[PDB]
Design a protein around this ligand. Structure first.
Ligand SMILES: C[S@@+](CC[C@H](N)C(=O)[O-])C[C@H]1O[C@@H](n2cnc3c(N)ncnc32)[C@H](O)[C@@H]1O
Ligand SMILES: C[S@@+](CC[C@H](N)C(=O)[O-])C[C@H]1O[C@@H](n2cnc3c(N)ncnc32)[C@H](O)[C@@H]1O
Lengths: 210, 205
């Protein structure tokens, strides 16, 4: 209470993800998860980005605006409910324009306000001797197969959106999560994707529709 | 759109000034400090599970602050937020013991995040825009002074001095000029008897 500091977004995320549900736990292994960072008036000049052409990945500090709280403690986790509500993700930088970044392998909701962009520095950010017992390894993963209709539908909508719809669906579903006959759904881009569990360890994509 | 943040705690650090803070802090394990957490984050329940994590991220405020700013880790940046990974040596109720830090004394900490190797260590990452080592020798007096102040402070003064100097705290150093840095309540003095050798002259405080 004896110190308050005010932050304002430098830009907003426009993302493939419209819901928190099927957003990957290992985002950088979902490289088809694409999105853009639309930068705000004073940070939209190309000069604020000069040099990023030689950096592959960037950190984004952002606000968990849809995370609406100290058995693990909050500071031992990467949970979205935190005392100052700030997130941090490293995403691949595919390219950039004047007031726009093209991002890949994101774990960010659509409409995420971004407070900062930091270049990933391997000698400082990749700690080889780091060990995390609660982490250890990315999530296990599930096999994904396609109905013939869904494969064709993902291809059509992929050509329409100019997005790798099929790969994103496959990469998101290999995580996910129950019932064997139930079809589940997620909104990706402007699409509704439906799937089910023909076997406890196999997901089958049913249909992709706008 | 405005959002307000307040510190969860403040850093108590060995570094009182920006100069000679190592450019690779995690290779300076004697760069020690603590994070004193304020209430309601003083309760140990907020830290349960940290016993199995080696390193931690600290989001903090740069309270004492032709590449683009977003292409750098500069301390003068929009919203003024820093991000550092430090080794976690231990934790008690409202205190974290940190090692290999690059943070000024009195820095407000906004968040604590566990370092997750599979998510934070990008093996195929590449950074061209980002930016060696020098030999260090000691005068007998400075060796004795660093040890005495280390026992008084209960801090590894001699190791921190050597670890900071070994990264060449530096555009060219003059041969007759004395250079120095404040560490804790000490003023450490050295010079360059040769362009590839640092000699520690004195430790005072
Ligand atoms: C456990 S978090 C880790 C996020 C980030 N890598 C970090 O460590 O700060 C992963 C969840 O972030 C959530 N998320 C992403 N953007 C969000 C937002 N804008 N508001 C609330 N939650 C969000 C998604 O649901 C995603 O599954
Ligand atoms: C180039 S910065 C990077 C800091 C952080 N690892 C990051 O990437 O955001 C490292 C420098 O920050 C400065 N520094 C540390 N604490 C500071 C503070 N509290 N306010 C302003 N500068 C600080 C010192 O010059 C330190 O060597």
């Amino acid at each position: 209470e004896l110190m308050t500091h005010s932050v304002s977004p430098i830009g907003y995320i426009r993302s493939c993800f419209m819901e928190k549900f099927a957003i990957p736990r290992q985002p950088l292994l979902a490289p088809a998860a694409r999105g853009t960072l639309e930068l705000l008036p004073p940070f939209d000049q190309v000069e604020a980005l000069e040099g990023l052409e030689q950096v592959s990945h960037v950190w984004l500090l952002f606000l968990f605006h849809q995370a609406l709280p100290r058995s693990l403690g909050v500071f031992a986790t990467r949970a979205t409910h935190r005392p100052n509500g700030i997130g941090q993700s490293v995403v691949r930088l595919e390219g950039f324009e004047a007031g726009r970044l093209w991002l890949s392998g994101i774990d960010l909701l659509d409409g995420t306000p971004v407070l900062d962009i930091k270049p990933y520095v391997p000698y400082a950010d990749a700690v080889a001797d780091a060990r995390n017992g609660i982490a250890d390894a990315p999530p296990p993963g599930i096999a994904v197969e396609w109905s013939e209709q869904a494969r064709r539908q993902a291809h059509e909508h992929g050509q329409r959106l100019r997005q790798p719809v099929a790969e994103l669906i496959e990469q998101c579903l290999a995580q996910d999560p129950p019932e064997p006959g139930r079809r589940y759904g997620v909104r990706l881009w402007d699409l509704d994707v439906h799937w089910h569990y023909p076997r406890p360890d196999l997901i089958r994509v049913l249909d992709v529709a706008g």
